[PDB]
Amino acid sequence: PPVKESSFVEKMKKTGRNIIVFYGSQTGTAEEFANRLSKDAHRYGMRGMSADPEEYDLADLSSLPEIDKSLVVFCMATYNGDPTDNAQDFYDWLQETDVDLTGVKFAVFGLGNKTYEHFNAMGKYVDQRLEQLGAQRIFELGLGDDDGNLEEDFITWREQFWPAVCEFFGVEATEESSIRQYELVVHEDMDVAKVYTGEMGRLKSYENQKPPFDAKNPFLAAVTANRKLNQGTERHLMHLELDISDSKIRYESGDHVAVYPANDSALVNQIGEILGADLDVIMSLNNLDEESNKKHPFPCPTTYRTALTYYLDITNPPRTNVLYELAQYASEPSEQEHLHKMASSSGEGKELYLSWVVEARRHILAILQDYPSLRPPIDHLCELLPRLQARYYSIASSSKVHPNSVHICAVAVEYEAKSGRVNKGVATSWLRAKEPAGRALVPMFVRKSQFRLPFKSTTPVIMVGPGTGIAPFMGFIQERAWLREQGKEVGETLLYYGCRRSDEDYLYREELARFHKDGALTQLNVAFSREQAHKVYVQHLLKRDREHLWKLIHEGGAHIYVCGDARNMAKDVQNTFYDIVAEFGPMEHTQAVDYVKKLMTKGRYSLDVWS
């Protein structure tokens, strides 16, 4: 229960703001969009501020009309058909309230991914609900699809949004001058005890650990084990064990473990070297808006090296506003023009951004090397880069068997980018380098999920997780085996797993064989996709066992679980379940779909997919 800030409307009145942009974000994408819209206000004679709804009480929206030409914008992401954690309060409020929002003007931009049944559910709800409550829409709902290109969807919406705002309120495009949000303050003689060295919350919080641990106060768990899971050399799949003893962290199979990684030191050093900057300068970036709660873009004071290493994202392709602001620092005309045009909503500038930056997966260093005239000051770059996010992993262990250890099953990311270089996954490269052996510590925390084994030990379980999708099921199988050892009555436990070849990347091969031998796994159905000319996938095995699965589903009350790739595997497995139901019900495809979607609402078809 966070302590709410005082009314955001009064803050707007006291600081001359007429527009406030709220963000529902978990990976920081909606947060950036909000900040971008907020900063935009200035270019149209208005003044905005972005804000975390969790820190506020949206009921004060009814007071917003008290400000002339006032407006509120919501940039909301959706997660599993639900609101972001930080937007749950606001969501619950929209449902319970009956407050009259007459006079309130709003606009909504939703961040979603079409590869989901509930595409932009949050953005759609917020947009619809504010209207039901009496507020009037000032611009159409935005539907950003992260499966195509979200950045482009924002550009398009934004380009139309402002002219519509200006026309309704009768304001002009007062043109654009580079404006810093922070001021640099170099520190020449500061006590080392006050310089952030990578911690996420309070100073020295990593050195002096105190519970409870969470996203703002992660627990530095020792890496007790880090072994290679795959047999061959095509790729690198690994199994790590994080010791959470004395952390008091609670967890259950199905939960996720998040880790705060460190960027590649070489990459950090090269960025500093190409900019001719001294990365060991101790400094702070202080907000020019002395009223804002966001005093720095990241924990300060600190060195540029530490910022680029633990607080800043220096690997993902930079967004258009970043390249736009950096353009001023490119001394070669043609290069200044290419960067400037990256923010176009159409044409060659847009196409170049999509192919040369996004498709080629060029990170900031690559751009600095490919456009050699671009030499921005390090301090402004640090202000522009997005924050380094934590990465989530499906805990591969059962707390009933390993209450003081959190297991991770992950594939190391390393690929040839069309940018011509080899790109390395931040968290996995970092995880892979951690050696059991001070100790190898990993800053982490647990996030509870709704992916859970049936409450009743007798309820049948059908698990589908090819590749790394196996990771929560190792926890499930462990727990189910443990239940049998405790004398309990355990229903059928079926695993449908898949890999390329039994001698290449069959994860947990020995463990799964043991569980099967001992009866913990009623069936171990493995699809080896490359051992023959045609592909053999998990859904092929499900179709093969359609008769039995239907019996378990329709008569046994079986629970279905699907983990892994959400792009193709999940949809294909879902389609196969449609076919099974349709044939054995029997019923028309349309009803089969409803039947399966119903199982999802009744908690009997759960997902843990990602891209």
Ligand SMILES: Cc1cc2nc3c(=O)[nH]c(=O)nc-3n(C[C@H](O)[C@H](O)[C@H](O)COP(=O)(O)OP(=O)(O)OC[C@H]3O[C@@H](n4cnc5c(N)ncnc54)[C@H](O)[C@@H]3O)c2cc1C
């Ligand atoms: C809820 C959830 C559960 C997850 N569970 C697990 C898990 O249990 N095990 C696991 O291994 N992962 C899991 N992940 C994925 C994990 O969170 C990270 O996204 C993954 O490990 C990569 O992170 P990274 O920092 O190593 O790579 P990053 O530096 O974050 O880079 C990731 C990006 O690289 C790009 N990329 C990757 N390959 C290519 C390529 N070949 N060509 C072009 N672009 C490419 C993509 O844009 C990808 O988004 C899960 C993710 C979520 C959201």
Ligand SMILES: Cc1cc2nc3c(=O)[nH]c(=O)nc-3n(C[C@H](O)[C@H](O)[C@H](O)COP(=O)(O)O)c2cc1C
């Ligand atoms: C675990 C997970 C679940 C998601 N579930 C949904 C969903 O149900 N619907 C949707 O439209 N998008 C979904 N998305 C996509 C996000 O809404 C989209 O990537 C958004 O840009 C993230 O914004 P953020 O960085 O501000 O949190 C999901 C993404 C992840 C990683």
